[PDB]
Design a protein around this ligand. Structure first.
Ligand SMILES: OC[C@H]1O[C@H](O[C@H]2[C@H](O)[C@@H](O)[C@@H](O)O[C@@H]2CO)[C@H](O)[C@@H](O)[C@@H]1O
Ligand SMILES: OC[C@H]1O[C@H](O[C@H]2[C@H](O)[C@@H](O)[C@@H](O)O[C@@H]2CO)[C@H](O)[C@@H](O)[C@@H]1O
Ligand SMILES: [K+]
Lengths: 29, 975
């Protein structure tokens, strides 16, 4: 595991970015 | 030090307080490093700043203002949070796409660490020269530059070690004739660069010679550093074809968006005024469907690709060459560093045995051990033999030991005998140590002492007065020796000559037989030449050197030494002694590499210093030619090539796979002639002479272990000098391409889907299948998770079985643009069909199986005529979730169709890109949250039934995989 391990890092950042977006729509209300 | 050109060497050394023999101390380096900074342009300095960039777009803000006007009209009268939600989604769509772009750009920038600018200094801490990063060079240190080097800083020349120093300064001064240098002050302090003949400017080249100097200015203060400040700073063919297509797609979608604002003419009245509803729906499609600015995933697989390449030893210097790389149709490769290992070993040799009239017999020998170790036996007729019993071998060894600027060195940590000078010469040192012709005691010596023990026994019988260095016209070198301390019978001075057989044998009037001498005849010559040929042409394709002595050499003051062209004459009237045959095996991976090139339709041309006959034989061994192929028109020497008329020379390059013994100007010509057939050629090189050809070649390839000048003229550097590395770089080049096309296919179809989806609703007159915030929701999940996962999919399956891509090829073929529309058409219809299905044939309060839903517009007051049901089930929160869910799942499906350009999922299974599968599961677990976590479905729409409704979402979506399979079949089985 070396180069394939940067796919997990890439998606996790994008997941967090999308997830945070939803939780802010939750809080607003 | 501002005006160093006008001061003495002694003033410059004085100024920095530095010894010229010593160089700066670690303390001085430290203080100078603080005072003057690093030898570099200052780094130009983000996370938040780059997010605002996306919000500068006119069409993005048009949406926001429309959601503000829609919010203000509510507050003075779902619709309340709409402006808040869109903003949150669009910052998230920005963050996801801007974060990829920056990391790709950083990774690509970080390629520069593989081949960093280097310099040579003498510093006080070592006696030996130190190779360091130019970055760490400081004003005041002592610098060594020689042929092929890039000048690391602005340097006042201290002393010119070669007879003459030649410098290429064109990059600064426009003059492309290399320039002479001196050491005296140039008094005029106002003087122009052209006149500073004692100065070496950063960024320039040593075209010949060697010099020592003191650093005067670095970083910005340097001549080229001042220019690079004032300097202010071209699209590739595939960038033009992508931008142009970007505008063809952009304007069609922009027209269709306004066409959505038109066909909904009368509907501005239902619960000038309602146009703010259909305008804010049209603009959202524009923001989702039109790709404005380069999609980030593109730059990611270029970044991932050249990172892969660098790990496979291909260092990309020019990024546009990654595009050219998959178009290459010809590779020209040098043999020695590249096709072969360059590990030289003498495995055969012979001297003359008996001469009788026409009759000539030889003493042939073979030698075991192929590393540089002084370990192996000398065999004759396969029997171990002691070389000294043969007086001719004593003489042969004397030549090998004296015609040699190399030695061996035992490396005590590595436990290995290593080479000092040139591979070829060191192979001779090794040989000499194995022959031990004078039976010197060696068995009790340390390995350190053993390395050169026998060579020095020879080296103590004479003085090596001087060397007639090698030159290309004669293909031979020689040394001139007198007997040391005087032997018994004062035998005269001698010359020892080694070089290419053909040339040296012609200059022999005698042959040695034991210690006796005999006239050189035709019969003897023919016998000498036939064995040279057999060993050149046999299984081991040996490189032969002939060794001779000039028995009565000219007197010393008859010989001029600074004039290389008189050297051949001095090497005439020779006595042939013997021949050595060198091994230099092909690299293990090379036969396979050449076969890959055949398969990919790439011609390979070998260039070698070997004689013609040997050159061909090597080509049969490595698969360039067939072991029986006719070759008489496909193989040429530089001489034969020079004798051809121009049109014939051209025709020769159309078909030739083997050039032997070429003048330095031949590579360029070969490039030109190959270009006259629209060949995309890759050409290797390493010397200052290889630079012009590397420039002309579509891909110039420099050797990692070669000069900087060759590297500076190239697109790619081979870290391990290996031919296979090149082929593998073509392999990646083609892979990156197919990766772009896989992402391009998924992007265009999914956006086209968005368009066809919405257009169908407005065109027919159906009730909105997707609300704008829903559209901006799907547009974000796909571009965020699954779309970026395709940046991480493997090489496509048979990329080295298709021929090279043409540079004139269109980015998207008509057939491919069909695969974009047909797929995009089905998704658009499948989403609108999933909403319409709930109305038509679904058990949750339906419309009419004829056609009534079209006229949903007339209901609340128009109840008694043609309805008989409620009129708020058109604002229902279930048909819009069927449309959303079908889009999302068919998007995950369409991603599985982007695992390969033409391979079926039966050959390349869903689990090939295991990250894609992950991001899908992540996409589903996000979708099962805006339907179940109870504040969110209110801000969007409400959930779909636990079972029966999902089975429709799946039977609607899954045929997108089935469809693309047929289109892939009509591409696999079409070819
Ligand atoms: O270095 C001592 C060396 O000397 C002898 O080799 C002589 C040989 O006797 C002569 O024929 C003359 O040409 O010089 C040779 C090399 O110096 C010993 O035979 C030898 O073992 C020893 O190493
Ligand atoms: O062997 C016959 C040959 O002997 C002499 O040649 C010498 C030569 O002069 C020396 O320089 C020595 O290194 O090598 C030769 C012996 O192989 C005679 O001078 C010559 O005329 C005669 O033919
Ligand atoms: K080039």
């Amino acid at each position: 595991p070396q180069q394939a391990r940067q796919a997990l890092q890439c998606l996790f950042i994008n997941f967090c970015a999308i997830l945070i977006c939803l939780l802010l729509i939750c809080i607003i209300g | 030090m501002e005006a160093a050109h006008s001061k003495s060497t002694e003033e410059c050394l004085a100024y920095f307080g530095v010894s010229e023999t010593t160089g700066l101390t670690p303390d001085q380096v430290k203080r100078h490093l603080e005072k003057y900074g690093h030898n570099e342009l200052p780094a130009e300095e983000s996370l938040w700043e780059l997010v605002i960039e996306q919000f500068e777009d006119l069409l993005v803000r048009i949406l926001l203002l429309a959601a503000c006007i829609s919010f203000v009209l509510a507050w003075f009268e779902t619709a309340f949070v709409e402006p808040f939600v869109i903003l949150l989604i669009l910052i998230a769509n920005a963050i996801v796409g801007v974060w990829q772009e920056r990391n790709a750009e950083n990774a690509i920038e970080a390629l520069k660490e593989y081949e960093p600018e280097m310099g040579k200094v003498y510093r006080a801490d070592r006696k030996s020269v130190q190779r360091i990063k130019a970055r760490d060079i400081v004003p005041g240190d002592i610098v060594e530059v020689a042929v092929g080097d890039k000048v690391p800083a602005d340097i006042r020349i201290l002393s010119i070690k070669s007879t003459t120093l030649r410098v290429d300064q064109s990059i600064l001064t426009g003059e492309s004739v290399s320039v002479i240098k001196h050491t005296e002050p140039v008094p005029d302090p106002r003087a122009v660069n052209q006149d500073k003949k004692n100065m070496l400017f950063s960024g320039t080249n040593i075209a010949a010679g060697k010099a020592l100097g003191i650093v005067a200015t670095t970083g910005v203060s340097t001549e080229i550093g001042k220019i690079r400040d004032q300097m202010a700073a071209d699209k590739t063919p595939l960038q033009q074809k992508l931008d142009e297509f970007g505008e063809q797609l952009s304007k069609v979608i922009s027209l269709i968006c306004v066409a959505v604002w038109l066909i909904n003419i009368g509907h501005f009245n239902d619960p000038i005024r309602g146009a703010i509803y259909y305008f804010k729906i049209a603009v959202a499609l524009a923001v989702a469907a039109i790709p404005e600015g380069l999609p980030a995933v593109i730059t990611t697989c270029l970044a991932l690709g050249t990172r892969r390449m660098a790990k496979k030893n291909a260092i990309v210097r020019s990024l546009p060459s990654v595009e050219t790389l998959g178009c290459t149709s010809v590779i020209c490769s040098d043999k020695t560093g590249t096709l072969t290992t360059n590990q030289m070993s003498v495995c055969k040799m012979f001297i003359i045995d008996k001469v009788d009239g026409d009759f000539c017999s030889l003493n042939e020998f073979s030698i075991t051990g192929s590393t540089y170790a002084p370990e192996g036996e000398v065999l004759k007729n396969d029997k171990p033999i002691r070389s000294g019993q043969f007086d001719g071998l004593v003489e042969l060894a004397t030549i090998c030991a004296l015609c040699n600027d190399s030695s061996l060195d035992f490396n005590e940590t590595k436990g290995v005998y290593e080479k000092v000078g040139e591979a070829t010469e060191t192979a001779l040192t090794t040989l000499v140590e194995k022959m031990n012709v004078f039976n010197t005691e060696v068995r009790n010596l340390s390995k350190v002492e053993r390395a050169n023990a026998c060579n020095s026994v020879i080296r103590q019988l004479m003085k090596k007065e001087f060397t007639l260095e090698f030159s290309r016209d004669r293909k031979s070198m020689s040394v001139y020796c007198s007997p040391a301390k005087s032997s018994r019978a004062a035998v005269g001075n001698k010359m020892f000559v080694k070089g290419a057989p053909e040339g040296v044998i012609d200059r022999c009037n005698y042959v040695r037989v034991g210690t006796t001498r005999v006239p050189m005849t035709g019969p003897v010559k023919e016998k000498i030449l036939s064995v040279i040929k057999e060993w050149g042409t046999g299984r081991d394709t040996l490189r032969c050197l002939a060794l001779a002595t000039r028995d009565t050499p000219p007197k010393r003051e008859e010989m001029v030494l600074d004039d290389s062209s008189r050297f051949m004459e001095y090497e005439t009237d020779l006595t042939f002694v013997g021949v050595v045959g060198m091994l230099d095996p092909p690299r293990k991976e090379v036969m396979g590499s050449i076969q890959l090139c055949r398969d990919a339709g790439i011609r390979v041309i070998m260039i070698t210093g070997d004689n013609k006959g040997t050159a061909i034989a090597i080509c049969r061994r490595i698969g360039i030619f067939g072991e029986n192929e006719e070759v008489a028109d496909r193989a040429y020497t530089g001489r034969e090539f020079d004798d051809l008329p121009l049109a014939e020379q051209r025709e020769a390059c159309r078909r030739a796979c083997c050039f032997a013994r070429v003048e330095p100007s031949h590579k360029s010509k070969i490039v030109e002639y190959l270009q006259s057939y629209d060949e995309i050629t890759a050409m290797t090189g390493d010397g200052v002479n290889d630079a012009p050809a590397l420039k002309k070649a579509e891909i110039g390839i420099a050797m990692g272990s070669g000069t900087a000048v060759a590297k500076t003229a190239s697109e790619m550097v081979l870290a391990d000098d290996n031919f296979s590395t090149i082929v593998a770089a073509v392999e990646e080049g083609r892979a990156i391409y197919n990766n772009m096309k896989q992402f391009i296919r998924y992007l265009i179809s999914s956006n086209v889907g968005e368009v066809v989806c919405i257009f169908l609703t407005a065109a027919l007159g159906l009730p909105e299948a997707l609300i704008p915030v829903q559209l901006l929701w799907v547009n974000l999940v796909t571009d965020g998770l699954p779309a970026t996962a395709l940046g991480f999919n493997p090489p496509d399956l048979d990329i080295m079985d298709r021929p090279p891509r043409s540079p004139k090829e269109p980015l998207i073929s008509g057939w491919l643009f069909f695969r974009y529309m047909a797929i995009g058409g089905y998704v658009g219809a499948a989403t609108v069909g999933a909403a319409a299905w709930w109305f038509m044939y679904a058990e949750d309060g339906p419309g009419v199986t004829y056609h009534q839903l079209t006229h949903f517009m007339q209901c609340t007051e128009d109840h008694p005529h043609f309805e008989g049901l409620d009129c708020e089930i058109f604002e229902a929160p279930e048909p819009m979730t069927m449309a959303l869910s079908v889009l999302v799942t068919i998007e995950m499906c369409n991603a599985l169709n982007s695992l390969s350009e033409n391979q079926s999922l039966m050959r390349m299974p869903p689990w090939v890109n295991i990250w894609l599968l992950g991001s899908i599961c992540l996409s589903m677990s996000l979708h099962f949250l805006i339907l179940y976590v109870d504040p969110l479905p209110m801000i969007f729409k409400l959930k779909a039934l636990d079972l029966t409704q999902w089975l429709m979402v799946l039977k609607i979506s899954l045929p997108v995989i089935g469809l693309d399979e047929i289109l892939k079949f009509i591409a696999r089985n079409y070819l």
